[PDB]
Design an enzyme around this catalytic site. Structure first.
Site, short mmCIF file in Angstrom:
data_model
loop_
_atom_site.label_atom_id
_atom_site.label_comp_id
_atom_site.label_asym_id
_atom_site.label_seq_id
_atom_site.Cartn_x
_atom_site.Cartn_y
_atom_site.Cartn_z
N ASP A 133 28.02 30.95 42.42
CA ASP A 133 28.36 31.72 41.26
C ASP A 133 29.26 32.90 41.62
O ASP A 133 28.78 33.93 42.08
CB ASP A 133 27.08 32.23 40.60
CG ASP A 133 27.33 33.06 39.38
OD1 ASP A 133 28.47 33.05 38.88
OD2 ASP A 133 26.36 33.70 38.90
N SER A 169 45.65 37.02 33.62
CA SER A 169 46.51 35.90 33.31
C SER A 169 47.73 36.38 32.55
O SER A 169 47.66 37.34 31.79
CB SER A 169 45.72 34.87 32.49
OG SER A 169 46.55 33.82 32.02
#
Length: 330
Positions: free
Chosen positions: A35, A199
């Site tokens: 994770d 992004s």
């Protein structure tokens, strides 16, 4: 040193991925959920409340000659999906794919919430976010990666998650045969303890690319792609019959649909998530309403590039002094 381990979807939907991890001496192999959105290595154990164990493999520290109670240390974690676990702490030898760390903090669960109990395939979590998020008190502990880093050939790990197929976590090296083209690296902020990056935009299907900054985290421990409501609405508007359902808890769509791809930007590069990756199947058994793999992050407070996004890429978690993230197509 290096390590390399195969990671395997837990079910036919790729809801999560499990990777075998050797703990203790002799080794006890547990299948952990790696994770990159948390920083605790915790396991089901011989200390876990018996009624909260249902099929998981447990770590039994008393059977490990290298286990040592970390005196006074406790841990308690709550995840974004509302699940939680807590317990005490041992140090022990932990190996992943041939890479061994001695003195790793292994957080032994005394209590786990129902979602963990109900998932027999996940024996615990192995956190790969920054150690500043580790919950051990009163002495915070380091992640497996942080402990391994100095010994690694290169201070990196990579996630290569499969779509409906196994993939690989590598530590200490970049497998140049595992991706196509080049890896585009992008800046990371560690201010919130995550692999947080920005992004450069998105496209829906064959649509034009929208240049827009989307801050979010690369999180292998989250199944879906959570993005701003504007982006998500633009995606689902291209699927006839798709709608946001408050009762179901997100966007659903007719299972008869063919989903468009979703592209996200990494610098000037582009990662394309095929439409099929966005199908999470019937909302309930036999339903013709299917759950979407792109969902709104509104009210999460952060955008999350979970498995839906990451499995479309070869992802480098560069833990150099100034960390960065790399993405390549594959």
């Amino acid at each position: 040193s290096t390590g390399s381990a195969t990671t395997t979807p837990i079910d036919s939907l790729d809801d999560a991925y499990i990777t075998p991890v050797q703990i203790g001496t002799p080794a006890q192999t547990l299948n952990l959920d790696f994770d990159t959105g948390s920083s605790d290595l915790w396991v089901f154990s011989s200390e876990t409340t018996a009624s909260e164990v249902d099929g998981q493999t447990i770590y039994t520290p008393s059977k490990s000659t290298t286990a040592k109670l970390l005196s006074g240390a406790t841990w308690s974690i709550s995840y974004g999906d509302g699940s939680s676990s807590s317990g005490d702490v041992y140090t022990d030898t932990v190996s992943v794919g041939g890479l061994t760390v001695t003195g790793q903090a292994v957080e032994s669960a005394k209590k786990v919430s129902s979602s963990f109990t109900e998932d027999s395939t996940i024996d615990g979590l192995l956190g790969l976010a920054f150690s500043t998020l580790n919950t051990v008190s009163p002495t915070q502990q380091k992640t497996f990666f942080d402990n391994a880093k100095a010994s690694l050939d290169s201070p990196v790990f990579t996630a290569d998650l499969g779509y409906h197929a196994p993939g690989t976590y590598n530590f200490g090296f970049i497998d140049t045969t595992a991706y196509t083209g080049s890896i585009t690296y992008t800046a990371v902020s560690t201010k919130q303890g995550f692999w947080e990056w920005t992004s450069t935009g998105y496209a829906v299907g064959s649509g034009t690319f929208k240049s827009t900054s989307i801050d979010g985290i690369a999180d292998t421990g989250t199944t879906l792609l959570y993005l701003p409501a504007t982006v998500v609405s633009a995606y689902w508007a291209q699927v006839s019959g798709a709608k946001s359902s408050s009762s179901v808890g997100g966007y659903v769509f007719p299972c008869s649909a063919t989903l468009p791809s979703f592209t996200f930007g990494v610098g000037s590069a582009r990662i394309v998530i095929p439409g099929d990756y966005i199908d999470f199947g019937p909302i309930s058994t036999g339903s013709s309403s299917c759950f979407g793999g792109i969902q709104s992050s509104a009210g999460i407070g952060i955008n999350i590039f979970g498995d839906v996004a990451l499995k479309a890429a070869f992802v480098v978690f560069n833990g150099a002094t100034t960390p960065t993230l790399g993405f390549a197509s594959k």
